[PDB]
């Protein structure tokens, strides 16, 4: 669905595999196991269907309180949070979000919610 998210995800898995290859070797685990990790990782991602991947063709109250493929969740960084009365404004950055089984990634996010 989202090109950017697709790209970001693919770059992450290839990049993580390269960063840990050194730790696998250091642990006595061979290259095939590292590859296996990439494969299972890829398959799982395709199974979620939050976006399409280039490898897809290969896989044809007043007190605090949920988390799953159906929870709409945004994970990211924050530049500044401010509120005036009940009006909140949130400047976010470098984040990823799942909205209705679909994923998006962002450079910046602007939030404007009224606590009422």
């Amino acid at each position: 669905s989202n090109a950017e998210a697709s790209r970001v995800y693919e770059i992450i898995v290839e990049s993580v595999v390269n960063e840990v290859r050194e730790d696998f070797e250091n642990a006595g685990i061979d290259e095939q196991t590292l590859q296996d990790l990439k494969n299972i990782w890829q398959k799982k991602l395709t199974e979620t269907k939050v976006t399409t991947f280039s490898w897809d063709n290969q896989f044809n109250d007043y007190l605090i309180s949920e988390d799953g493929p159906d929870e709409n969740l945004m994970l990211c960084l924050y530049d500044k949070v401010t509120r005036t009365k009940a009006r909140w404004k949130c400047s976010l950055k470098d984040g990823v979000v799942t909205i209705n089984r679909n994923d998006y990634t962002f450079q910046k996010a602007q939030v404007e919610a009224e606590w009422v």
Partner: protein, 101 residues
């Protein structure tokens, strides 16, 4: 001396945890190696989102709950409009960390 771990709760991070657990249960790797992969993941996600992200979305809605503890902001936005690049969303949980140390 590390990066935030919130991203492990994301779709890609959760899938990595899954893949990592199957190899652990198969006895193909040690849990320690799995944890080390997760910690590298934290770094890589932070860098990939910082250097290969261009989109800029915005959220408008009613803040149902907010919270700030341990330098972390949590927001539950209900009945909001998420515009990417427009999406209607009944509920949206936002968990964010400080961009600064």
């Amino acid at each position: 001396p590390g990066y935030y771990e919130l991203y492990r709760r994301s779709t890609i991070g959760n899938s990595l945890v899954d893949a990592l657990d199957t190899l652990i249960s198969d006895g193909r790797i040690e849990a320690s190696l799995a944890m080390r992969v997760l910690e590298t993941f934290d770094k890589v996600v932070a860098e990939t989102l910082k250097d290969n992200t261009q989109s800029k979305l915005t959220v408008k809605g009613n803040l149902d709950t907010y919270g700030f503890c341990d330098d972390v902001w949590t927001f539950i936005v209900k009945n909001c409009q998420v515009t990417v690049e427009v999406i209607s969303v009944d509920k949206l949980r936002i968990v964010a960390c400080n961009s600064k140390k």
